[PDB]
Symmetry: C4
């Protein structure tokens, strides 16, 4: 009708002439204008992904973790404190549009938090916009990420409110049912391209949040203009993630649920389930890092800015999708970076 | 060849700036120019969906039930009389193009019915047009819904026949095999927005009938210009629905069949199937989930009213790959969700 | 260009003054051959012989006897049909050395229509075939297949063919598009050939890929004078072969004429299909479906169907909406699955 | 975003007028200007696909096999020698970009190799262009194939580097995960078609490598303009391939793995997977079916030669439903088909 939007599986990157080996690329990126990460990875702010244990591991990996707000204000400030009490580690906290929102900001700021994430289901709303201005009035130097959005117009209005960064993604999450119960959402790839274009026109970087399943998907997001990528599912199985280990018919599992699921709220827009135990975060990141560098090797990109400036996309069909994945083969040895 | 028509699964709505919250929006819709609903929901006129018990619950919930015509004229009048006697409640009655069509209409009008619906497989037929013209000639004050159509040309013809509202949908039904056995039909979303646009010019509202699986599908149908959504499958497993609770493999199910199926025809070539649907419980609990999802969508599009929703709605087309990520993926769902399965 | 098959498209409802019990299914197969209903059984060694061809003509269609037998045997099969009242009968010939001997035999048996069935109808061998036959028998009705292009219609109509069979690859037992990579999606194929055929006053037969009665309507609306089917009639008692039981279920062997078994590099497969029972009740569901379809388009005649037919394309999501969904079917419909 | 790119399964070939029978067509092709093959088939340079046993079988069958480089320099030169001394047989040898690459080239040339393949994940790079130049400057008469690429620009750079032949394919391999872990690649048919077109302007042939499952897939590649087709999956299950015949549940299998898999590389990040495929018996039977399938295709398009096949070939695009129609459907296949599974 208006246009057809695409997600990550609809698209492929086209190989460019390369004069750079995968081990020669640099994954440095600017999260906000005052905060630089060594790798463009962020762990999701959920009660089953990121607490003290995960945030410390991520920051030590060159990324950053966002402490979830599904706890008391006192507890969250203590979680942030733990991360800051172990070296100069970057740490983020989650803030929501509520009645005690400023009291919550006051606590984590005193806990010396680096970045604040103001995430609601609908970022392009009166609550979020006025909320950002209200936070930027008391703490002008505090770095603020707002979300989530899916349109260029939302990027502009959030920038006007004083946001330093915006989170992009309405519906792509593996645990998300927003597009099903509300019928609302924009396919993540198109959403990232449209928002990053407007973002680079105003000087405000964007974050690709949700829908990422493979390392190659991250390369598509980074080549679409995203300054960083947020994942829950990929990190939820890691040992650094909250929750106990469950054994189900010989295999090991970890629980994983959306912040809009029934259990987390204790009308839902998320589900609740389990994912396979992956082990330590370091091993997951290694395969992710290696895959991205390999991708940037194919495109001749030494940095992430060169990746974006010289990336060409092509659309693939259902048949092309089957060709991209391994096919007509009975896999006997599982790979660390696939399935 | 002519064009590409889309269904609900094909599209998604784009979020607008929002200065409203889901608990602040109004769901009041306008069925006909005289009949107003509090929520744009109505139960399908099917022998396994809407009887007096269901029609009562639908009305008290803010919507309206439509009594099916698979029974004697005397019995259908009694079903309506049961609904209207228990409080001042809205009620609908189904009429078909038959020989005793007018006498069936005569009976339900005597039972103080609010709206008549001339539902048939092919609404854009001579029998319906001449049929509506007779009902409107005898009862000029009686509100008439006529279906089913799928093209704007049929909207012009039925409205010209005197209809007050039209019902859209040929094929979308969960129990429907019309598109398979006849090869005839139009994907419901394209069908709805085509007819609603034409009906908007003539001032005749349209009804999105069939094909709605989740609460988000309704939001799409309302944004496409429909004034109300008709559903059979969603309500079929509810307590207020006709039929006994049958147990299959230790789970509770109710029988749900098509009006054009083999079983329904025997009651009084098939274009429907017969099957079972899980028992969902009381209607209020199912309506609550539907309303909540609809109010969320209107919160996302920043629309306080159903009209404003239609005025500022932007659809985007997703592929089968986009359909995958739109649903939950890469996770073993263990806990149960009230609005997803 | 992207070409479509039957499941890609849907017919759009028109204004209707006619009812399904009033329509007419009379069609003109050739110029001087007409059927009461536009259905014909495939000339396959597991579908059509005298018993099937007799049943087909009695219902109002016509069956074509397969050529996978001796010239004497196929001549007897035709006679067995012709003896059983004034019943229509068809016979298939191929581009062979004794093709003229086979033609002479079935003509002597007073067959009504002949069909040259080749994998590639648009070839030198088939054009010579039609032209050589029409020289000896200017009054013998000839169908020629298979083709998929309008150019092929022209070249075949100019050879003296009375009708052309359309379909390369849609067959349920076919692997041509897989082993050769050649073919055209049947709907676009019939639609393109039908338009060219109307210009020349030559009818086209939609052959292969027909699963439901709605699919048959789509072909007729595209401009096909008739529809040929193997799979829908394969499991019937009137079809050749014996009933084989496999793990409790009664099946009949159905196989492509280009499979290893029928040849005794294949372009067909050999499989089993469920026992459907008598042909009469299958036809009753097909005819009634086609009637329903025509009623939706306000078409009293087949030629009126084609003139006012408007197609529309659906996605794979619209496909899942067209079939019955989100319900556990407990009773098998007589015309669906 | 650019145009949409297609896979073999996305398209079909339109039949042409034909005066030729499949038994009359010729399958001769020029792999390079100096090298001619009786049949346009190649085996992949992989440790689970091609060694002297396979190369000899491929050669005797009219094609050529490329010895892989997962062995020492003395071992590979030894394998090449076995093929050359067995009879007047063609043989290829695979080379990678390393410090000992010129030493390895010297060895296989001394073994009288016919063609060198510079195999790498990304042929369009500084390393490969320098390699082709460094080799050609020392061995001007030696035939050099370069890959892998997927763009016409890469063709020009390789041709300008001195390459005699270009291998295309980024990610279509059956055991490949490059498009999944790097998100990089081009659907093979579009790649082959683009690279062949640029090749025709320059006068340099292109190989279609990977993603071929059926004989009909090969025909599309050849019609797109490729000079030959390189296959791993189709050949790896044969007896002449390396690796023992493994058994599982009364069914005999063989091990087939990608050269970028964890097992073949022997921390690292893999771009391939290891698995198992069915035992197909002898290569002679497999080749016979592939040849027969191509001869059939050429007869459909009225093409007596491969060059005549490319010139009058018309492609059409099919949807998902067309894909279902193209394959066998609604039938329980009982007997085994020698060219379909
Ligand atoms: O709050 C939720 C659902 N929800 C979630 C959640 C979080 C992330 C993604 C999806 N849903 N978490 C919740 C926790 C409690 C209650 C409702 C919740 N959804 C909406 C929907 C429309 C809105 C319009 C304007 C302003 C806010 C709106 C909020
Ligand atoms: O004859 C068959 C295969 N075949 C079939 C068959 C029939 C219909 C559809 C597909 N295949 N039946 C056969 C019976 C015996 C031997 C081969 C057969 N295939 C071909 C393929 C290309 C041709 C090009 C020019 C002239 C004739 C050509 C024939
Ligand atoms: O009557 C039914 C089938 N049918 C149904 C039904 C109702 C809704 C959706 C699908 N089918 N209910 C029936 C009850 C009795 C007999 C037939 C019935 N279908 C048709 C089909 C084409 C028509 C064309 C012109 C006029 C009327 C036509 C009717
Ligand atoms: O070589 C591999 C991975 N790899 C493979 C392999 C072979 C064929 C297809 C895919 N991958 N085989 C390997 C063997 C050892 C180590 C890495 C290997 N990956 C890449 C990816 C992008 C590059 C860009 C410029 C230069 C070199 C690049 C290398
Ligand atoms: O329950 C919810 N409903 C919808 N989206 C959610 C919910 N919980 C988390 N998300 C989003 O999904 C992202 C992670 O999804 P995933 O990594 O693709 O599994 C988070 O960073 C949030 O943006
Ligand atoms: O048997 C039938 N054949 C075709 N459509 C039907 C039949 N019975 C009911 N319908 C339609 O399908 C609607 C309900 O389908 P659902 O709510 O989408 O499951 C009804 O309101 C009718 O419009
Ligand atoms: O072996 C074969 N290979 C390819 N096509 C075949 C073969 N046998 C029959 N056909 C075609 O397929 C049609 C029937 O297919 P179906 O109706 O789709 O089952 C026949 O009328 C022939 O046109
Ligand atoms: O591990 C790998 N990763 C990616 N591609 C590979 C790998 N190993 C082999 N290939 C390619 O895949 C081709 C064979 O794929 P197939 O014929 O589709 O099985 C080879 O000729 C190589 O071009």
């Amino acid at each position: 009708i208006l246009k057809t939007a695409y997600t990550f599986d609809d698209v492929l990157l086209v190989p460019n002439k390369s004069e750079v080996l995968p081990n020669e690329v640099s994954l440095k990126t600017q999260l906000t204008k005052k905060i630089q990460l060594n790798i463009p990875l962020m762990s999701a702010s959920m009660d089953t992904v990121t607490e003290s244990k995960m945030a410390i591991a991520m920051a030590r990996e060159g990324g950053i973790g966002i402490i979830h707000k599904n706890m008391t204000i006192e507890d969250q400030a203590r979680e942030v404190d733990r991360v800051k009490r172990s070296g100069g580690l970057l740490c983020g906290a989650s803030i929501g549009v509520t009645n005690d929102m400023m009291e919550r900001v006051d606590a984590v700021v005193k806990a010396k938090v680096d970045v604040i994430v103001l995430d609601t289901a609908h970022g392009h709303s009166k609550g979020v916009i006025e909320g950002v201005k209200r936070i930027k009035a008391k703490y002008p130097e505090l770095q603020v990420i707002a979300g989530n959005i899916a349109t260029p117009e939302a990027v502009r209005d959030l920038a006007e409110a004083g946001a330093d960064c915006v989170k992009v993604g309405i519906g792509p999450g593996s645990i998300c049912t927003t597009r099903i119960v509300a019928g609302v959402g924009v396919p993540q790839l198109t959403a990232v391209m449209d928002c990053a274009e407007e973002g680079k026109k105003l000087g405000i970087p964007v974050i690709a949040d949700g829908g990422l399943k493979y390392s190659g998907d991250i390369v598509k997001a980074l080549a679409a203009g995203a300054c960083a990528a947020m994942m829950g599912s990929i990190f939820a199985g890691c040992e650094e993630a909250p929750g106990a280990i469950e054994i189900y018919q010989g295999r090991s599992y970890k629980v994983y649920r959306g912040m809009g699921s029934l259990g987390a709220m204790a009308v839902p827009e998320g589900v609740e389930g389990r994912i396979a135990y992956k082990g330590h975060l370091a091993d997951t990141i290694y395969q992710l890092i290696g895959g991205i560098k390999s991708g940037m090797g194919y495109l001749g990109a030494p940095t992430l800015e060169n990746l974006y400036e010289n990336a060409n996309f092509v659309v693939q069909t259902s048949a092309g999708f089957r060709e991209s994945h391994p096919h007509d083969i009975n896999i006997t040895k599982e790979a660390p970076n696939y399935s």
